């Protein structure tokens with residue numbers, strides 16, 4: 001009760017204080033065979049996280065670690081296998097029976113307790129993002145079974161509060177995915193969740209639109225900029241997993257970008273988000289057109305939309321801010337692959353009017369960015385900025401393989417930058433072997 005409480009408090013301390021377990025998940029996995037009963041005392045954990053002390057209170061850093069450890073135990077119980085990296089997977093009768101009973105316990109428990117957790121820690125972005133990994137493990141049918149409607153209402157209230165308070169990409173994305181899970185995974189509560197979502201979206205589209213209008217009519221305030229960016233971020237996050245096409249967001253994104261090319265003075269983060277949002281609008285237009293039975297004019301309206309957006313990305317390669325060039329580059333390399341001739345696979349030859357061959361000018365600019373921003377002369381931030389340039393080249397590599405860009409001009413650039421490997425590498429290789 002408090003006995004298991006002590007063991008959990010010290011388990012959190014051994015985790016943080018020793019560098020003997022770097023990954024929470026790997027710690028839990030390793031103790032799992034021997035300490036399952038303890039590691040699934042979820043009532044004990046939420047009690048620690050929600051109660052006020054008598055004495056000795058938990059420190060902000062230890063609270064964080066307990067939430068992270070709790071969520072790993074919730075996964076390991078639900079999935080009934082070691083985490084990604086410690087795998088090898090056939091369950092016994094009793095292992096299977098235990099998994100069902102565990103999923104039951106943590107669903108009933110966290111439906112009640114997850115809104116109370118999100119309420120208390122609502123401003124801690126890292127913590128809220130971690131709590132919102134929990135619903136994916138819910139046995140969602142139980143939101144009906146337990147006459148538990150009052151607690152679905154409570155989670156939706158708390159997700160609303162979080163999204164309204166936060167702009168961090170991890171938080172919002174966590175909110176987006178939770179709605180997705182809550183919505184399309186059980187018909188019983190699908191209708192209730194859909195009404196909460198679209199009211200949330202509605203309130204953010206109105207605020208976005210009023211702020212776009214404010215910015216563009218204006219001299220332009222710091223408030224005008226905050227208001228656009230803050231609302232655009234929430235909508236960009238959600239527009240990946242949710243079809244927000246019914247709200248014409250591409251329209252205002254398009255103006256923001258046109259204004260930031262013309263007068264060249266649009267803040268870098270607005271341009272990046274405005275690009276990402278426009279992209280997600282187009283992908284969702286594409287899906288409705290693939291699955292629908294679309295007319296000639298449907299195709300030609302989406303085409304005009306796509307050619308104007310490829311134009312905007314091409315122009316945005318010339319933006320001073322390298323985060324914009326990167327975003328524009330990434331989108332060019334997705335779109336040029338998606339609206340290639342691949343689009344006429346699986347008997348979908350109706351889509352030919354949607355096919356786009358990049359011109360020489362554009363191909364040459366997609367070559368430039370690689371020389372300027374992939375292949376550059378000169379801690380943790382650099383292993384990360386390397387993986388990005390890797391992804392940027394890999395996204396560009398696909399265009400080379402299918403001759404969407406000039407495959408020869410490309411390999412010339414790869415000659416120029418590999419020269420020292422081809423001129424001195426054998427000599428460097430054998431030298432390093434003999435030390």
Ligand SMILES: Cc1csc(CNC(=O)c2ccn[nH]2)n1
Pocket residue numbers: 360363364365367368371405406409410
């Ligand atoms: C037909 C075609 C495709 S691109 C091209 C000429 N551009 C380049 O080769 C290049 C290298 C660096 N920047 N641009 N010709």
